[PDB]
Amino acid sequence: AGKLGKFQMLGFQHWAPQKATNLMVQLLAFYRGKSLDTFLNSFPTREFEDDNEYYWDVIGSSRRNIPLVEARDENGVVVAANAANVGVGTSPFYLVFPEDWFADGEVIVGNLNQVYPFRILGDARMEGTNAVYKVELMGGNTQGVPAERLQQGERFSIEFAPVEKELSRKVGDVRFTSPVSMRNEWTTIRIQHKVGNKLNKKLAMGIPMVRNLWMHYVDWEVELQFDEYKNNAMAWGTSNRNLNGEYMNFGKSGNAIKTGAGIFEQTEVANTMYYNTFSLKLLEDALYELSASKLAMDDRLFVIKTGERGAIQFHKEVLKTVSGWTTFVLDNNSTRVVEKVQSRLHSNALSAGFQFVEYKAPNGVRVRLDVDPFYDDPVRNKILHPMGGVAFSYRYDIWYIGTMDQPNIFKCKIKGDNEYRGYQWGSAVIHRMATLGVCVLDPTRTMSLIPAILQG
Amino acid sequence: LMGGNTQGVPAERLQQGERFSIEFAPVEKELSRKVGDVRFTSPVSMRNEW
């Protein structure tokens, strides 16, 4: 559980014979930079007319039950938690709700459904925005409703509106709802370089630790390191607005620098967990309660995207869980952790090794595992984990919870060509500019398990 | 501080040895001016003889 230094990266300011090979050599004792491109191209794109802010429709749900504000007896005195029963002998009492949602002559039920049904004896007398109903019990209930079952926050649903068969009068009503909507923004990126094919002042050399211790194409570095400015703005970007709509950072021209959130900030507004130790007890409980309330049983496949060391940590946590399944005797006949390989050295020659890549939870919750290579970035990820890696490979990200009939996460784009280029010959400065954006429609369909050492 | 931060960075997060990494260079929508730069790398050589 310890490193050894195999390289050191130094700037140049802190410093022909024959060639064995013509092309240069990348040593394995050197980290190499990682693209965010395969992660970003894993998402679709959607083009827009202009750089104006955009909005879309969010459609919700309808079935409400109404919390209680307070209950009162027939003289107006409120009901307390330690009080006696209310409505003894079908004596009427009052039931204060923050809204007018029920109608005259309707049976409503509290937390204990149908044990104490309440029949509303008239319209709601207004008290500010509150609505006070006179109610009474509707089940042959002689002894009243207890005072615990008439406190604040108790939910009340509608049941029906029963009448008498002879000479009845009108009761009941119907109820209506409406949808909501949400927004997103864009952001603008710019690069420059004062240049032709030769390096300039930001140079760094890589010295390896071994025992006895060309010409730069500038048009390939301004395209690669500006493609990476757009990759970092897309995936790792942050918004600078107030809740007053005010941007907080102003540029060189006095106009505000407008920035929009990225992939990893928009999906970290829901379902996000920061753990200090990894468990399947935390993972299978987080994924079941989300699937029990949102997903059908067949539609419960969860593809964990994580790093390479997140795969060996998930392997040892399933293996610890399997090692506590003392009911079942795991054999080599089915699992084949020791199989028979062909070798010159022996007739019966064996092999050994295995890895848990999937975990199947009760009620159809299936957890799979694949590795994205961009979690293991030595440049961006700088806090290290004591088990090896860069502590961001231990981050688990469930993208694509369910089926949506449309993409949830995509890359916004302006139709035509929103990338600009310019050369300022004096001084010879190459200028590039690009506007971009990322949209996550439903961030509640993305679960993240981040280590808590990357927080705060 | 850029990310909407209205409480400041902690003093623990500004000590010697903490590594820093370039993300991107943002500008306005209006009247923008030049920002950012490009970084390069240089090779060293190994040797053998006959």
């Binding site: 013509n22 092309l23 240069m24 990348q26 190499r32 930079g33 990682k34 693209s35 491109d37 395969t38 992660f39 094919n197 060309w214 010409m215 730069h216 194409y217 390939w220 570095e221 690669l224 994205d372 290579p373 961009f374 | 390069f40 790398t41």
Partner: peptide
Amino acid sequence: AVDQMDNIDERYGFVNQ
């Protein structure tokens, strides 16, 4: 050319001369 493990190549940015 980006490697299969997302690693970029630094030898494309040079010119042999």
